[PDB]
Amino acid sequence: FKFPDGVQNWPALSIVIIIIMTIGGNILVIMAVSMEKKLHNATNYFLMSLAIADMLVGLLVMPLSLLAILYDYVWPLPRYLCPVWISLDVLFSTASIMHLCAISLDRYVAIRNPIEHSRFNSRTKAIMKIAIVWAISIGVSVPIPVIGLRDEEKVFVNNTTCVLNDPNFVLIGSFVAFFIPLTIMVITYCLTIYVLRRQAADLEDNWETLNDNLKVIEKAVKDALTKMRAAALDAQKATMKDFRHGFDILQLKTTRNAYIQKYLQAINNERKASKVLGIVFFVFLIMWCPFFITNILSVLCEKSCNQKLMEKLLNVFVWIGYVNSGINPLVYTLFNKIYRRAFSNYLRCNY
Numbered sequence: 001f002k003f004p005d006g007v008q009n010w011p012a013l014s015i016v017i018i019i020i021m022t023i024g025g026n027i028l029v030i031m032a033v034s035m036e037k038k039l040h041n042a043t044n045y046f047l048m049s050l051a052i053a054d055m056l057v058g059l060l061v062m063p064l065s066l067l068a069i070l071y072d073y074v075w076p077l078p079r080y081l082c083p084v085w086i087s088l089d090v091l092f093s094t095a096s097i098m099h100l101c102a103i104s105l106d107r108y109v110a111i112r113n114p115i116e117h118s119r120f121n122s123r124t125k126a127i128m129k130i131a132i133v134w135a136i137s138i139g140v141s142v143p144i145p146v147i148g149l150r151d152e153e154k155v156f157v158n159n160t161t162c163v164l165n166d167p168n169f170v171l172i173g174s175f176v177a178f179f180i181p182l183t184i185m186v187i188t189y190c191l192t193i194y195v196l197r198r199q200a201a202d203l204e205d206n207w208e209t210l211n212d213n214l215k216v217i218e219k220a221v222k223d224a225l226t227k228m229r230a231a232a233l234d235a236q237k238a239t240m241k242d243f244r245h246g247f248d249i250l251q252l253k254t255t256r257n258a259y260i261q262k263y264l265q266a267i268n269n270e271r272k273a274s275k276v277l278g279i280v281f282f283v284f285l286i287m288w289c290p291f292f293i294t295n296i297l298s299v300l301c302e303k304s305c306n307q308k309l310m311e312k313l314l315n316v317f318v319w320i321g322y323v324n325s326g327i328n329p330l331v332y333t334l335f336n337k338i339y340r341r342a343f344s345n346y347l348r349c350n351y
């Protein structure tokens with residue numbers, strides 16, 4: 001570990017900046033979800049446990065990858081330390097996709113069959129769901145120290161570079177640890193975003209007409225006045241008892257701000273959450289695709305392919321996937337005033 005004698009790529013040390021921003025960024029997420037009241041809920045507990053995995057990627061996987069780059073991918077640490085790092089790489093990377101898939105799956109199940117959650121509270125129900133995503137993650141990574149130490153060629157190429165080299169494990173494992181959870185996250189997300197739009201459009205299309213027909217009354221009628229009573233007529237047929245009669249009493253603009261905005265902001269809130277999750281989901285998908293494509297493209301042709309080129313591309317493609325462990329705290333800041341406000345305060349009033 002930085003002898004320093006023997007190092008062959010000193011400008012690679014500049015990747016430390018990537019490492020520092022991946023740890024500190026997710027630390028702030030851990031601080032925010034731990035301290036902010038308006039962030040204490042199942043979805044944001046998922047993000048904290050996710051930030052714990054992404055912080056441990058930058059804390060335990062990124063530094064030992066950088067060290068290998070510094071020695072031209074000739075493993076500089078003891079040989080037993082290679083399969084330990086490979087399993088820590090697999091564990092925390094799987095925990096990332098397993099968190100995103102669990103968020104999208106729980107959000108989908110929360111919408112289809114929203115039965116009265118009478119068994120446990122939301123805080124404690126989240127704890128079990130976080131336990132299964134870590135239980136699976138440990139389950140995928142725990143064979144690797146066995147396979148690697150029992151047979152060192154499964155984790156060493158050319159007896160020098162430390163990389164996972166078991167084709168059966170890499171193939172089957174890529175399905176269990178990446179392809180299946182990614183397939184679930186995409187379908188559940190889109191299916192969720194389809195249900196949410198159909199149910200919101202029920203009230204929205206009635207609330208949109210009443211609003212538009214109010215503009216013509218300020219243009220500036222007996223057809224536009226009855227245009228607004230028919231709007232609320234269909235709105236009050238779907239939404240608790242204070243809502244049905246709430247429209248039946250509706251100068252008009254004051255009633256809209258009095259009680260309609262209670263649900264109007266509620267639906268917009270659900271829309272803003274689907275926006276953030278989709279960006280987090282599909283940026284994760286996009287930043288891991290080049291590595292996974294190039295990898296699964298490297299075994300579809302055993303020969304007839306430039307294997308030397310594949311490895312060189314994968315050296316860069318793995319860090320495109322790694323940088324994703326730092327991207328999530330940035331995304332929260334851009335799209336949520338609670339994270340952005342807490343982040344600026346932790347950077348100032350604490351640091």
Ligand SMILES: Cc1nc2sccn2c(=O)c1CCN1CCC(=C(c2ccc(F)cc2)c2ccc(F)cc2)CC1
Nearest residue numbers: 065089090093094097169170173174177178314315318
């Ligand atoms: C550090 C490094 N450097 C170089 S240079 C040239 C190659 N190369 C490498 O292969 C690696 C290891 C990359 N490492 C990324 C994390 C891994 C996942 C995984 C788990 C188990 C598998 F079976 C299949 C892949 C994963 C990826 C995304 C996820 F969302 C979840 C898991 C394991 C592979």
